[PDB]
Ligand SMILES: *[C@@H]1O[C@H](CO)[C@@H](O)[C@H](O)[C@H]1NC(C)=O
């Protein structure tokens with residue numbers, strides 16, 4: 001369990017172009033479970049939403065065909081930084097709704113825009129446990 | 135007396151008038167002085183692209199005797215051309231290029247993706263977001279020609295130049311310096327310092343792009359819009375996990391052209407390649423052209439300076455001129471090279487009046503001195519070099535006798551290379 005305050009910015013400036021490229025080349029709208037009751041905070045909750053999205057990106061790499069693996073992994077590499085922190089397993093209170101990969105990608109980009117200016121300024125060690133608030 | 139200059143024209147006005155000896159001149163431009171060094175005599179009066187400013191009263195006199203000359207350079211078409219100025223996007227992480235010229239010119243971007251600096255695709259869009267590493271270049275194409283600009287980027291992920299890197303800037307023109315850093319992990323940061331002191335608040339600009347297998351590439355730009363004698367100092371750029379690379383930055387309120395200056399006299403032998411080069415370091419873009427009895431040949435620009443050579447000699451001796459008129463300062467440099475072909479005496483002049491002048495030619499080592507040897511000779515040539523243009527070929531006459539020998543005819547050249555004689 002680390003301080004979770006990142007030495008240098010893990011959020012790149014070209015994430016929007018990478019996300020739009022995957023959104024435009026996706027042959028099928030894969031079924032993905034975004035969270036519906038995460039504790040109300042844009043900054044604190046941003047990391048939690050990215051942790052859930054990163055699991056989906058890794059899962060998509062194992063089911064997409066040969067031609068889509070490179071494009072899916074490109075998105076995975078932009079959000080892989082969440083695996084460096086000791087985030088704890090999701091609680092049983094967590095609820096989520098089924099959506100499409102296009103919506104998950106758009107939501108992921110939105111969370112990165114919100115987290116980017118704060119990721120190296122605040123200590124997020126207290127965010128390792130995902131919290132719910134119905 | 136009256137000169138008419140149409141647009142940024144490139145013509146020569148350095149005519150030569152027969153004045154050999156102890157003669158030295160000094161150029162007197164429009165309410166300003168101009169240092170020159172002529173060859174007696176002809177001084178630097180030729181112009182390449184006569185700017186709207188470069189026109190008016192131009193005087194020239196000899197100081198030893200003192201006679202002054204006067205020329206009136208006059209000039210409507212609204213033709214303008216200026217080097218492009220770089221800029222940072224308004225509320226966006228991108229760099230847009232703009233050029234102050236009439237009319238609006240087409241600006242394209244270049245980035246040599248290969249290991250070294252014609253190749254790589256040009257994206258003519260002005261607003262450039264994709265800019266990481268490689269040689270960044272921005273050129274404009276207006277109705278008055280083509281004015282190029284180069285965005286300086288010092289790549290930290292490379293071996294050091296070790297030749298004291300420098301970049302002179304024009305007072306008012308913005309200053310830009312970027313660092314193409316490559317680190318395997320995301321934990322790497324670049325910082326800007328002048329002399330161990332942090333960069334100004336209006337200079338920080340981060341653009342970290344992620345590339346290749348789990349690897350990041352960050353770039354820390356240094357933006358200074360209005361430059362002045364306040365920011366004339368050596369700027370360094372150190373990184374968290376990369377060595378400290380640095381580059382000095384000097385300012386000039388007008389401009390600068392500096393050149394080492396050679397001996398301007400060569401005893402070049404037959405063939406042997408031979409080249410006439412100039413060591414010139416100058417700001418801004420040095421417009422160069424070599425002149426040789428009507429010839430017009432433009433020139434190209436370890437790393438302390440940018441030199442250029444003129445290897446189009448092809449055994450053509452004489453005075454070679456090298457002008458370099460920048461967008462503010464002027465410079466000229468003449469050099470003298472002679473052929474080592476020492477020489478066959480054959481150009482005799484059949485003069486009937488008292489004695490026939492028998493002359494031997496070529497260059498530089500030539501001596502005319504005429505079965506058995508005959509005593510008492512006439513003239514012995516002896517004259518100074520570079521004495522106005524007129525007739526083709528120069529010879530050293532040395533024959534004017536009054537003895538009655540009949541059919542014999544003088545002229546027998548003797549030199550280090552050998553001997554020859556006329557009829
Ligand atoms: C993949 O990453 C490893 C570790 O940084 C490196 O050795 C390898 O060269 C990378 N692959 C490519 C194609 O650059």
Ligand SMILES: *[C@@H]1O[C@H](CO)[C@@H](O)[C@H](O)[C@H]1NC(C)=O
Nearest residue numbers: 334335361362363364365366
């Ligand atoms: C140089 O810049 C600093 C910071 O803006 C300022 O305090 C100082 O007066 C400037 N000096 C001159 C000579 O302009």
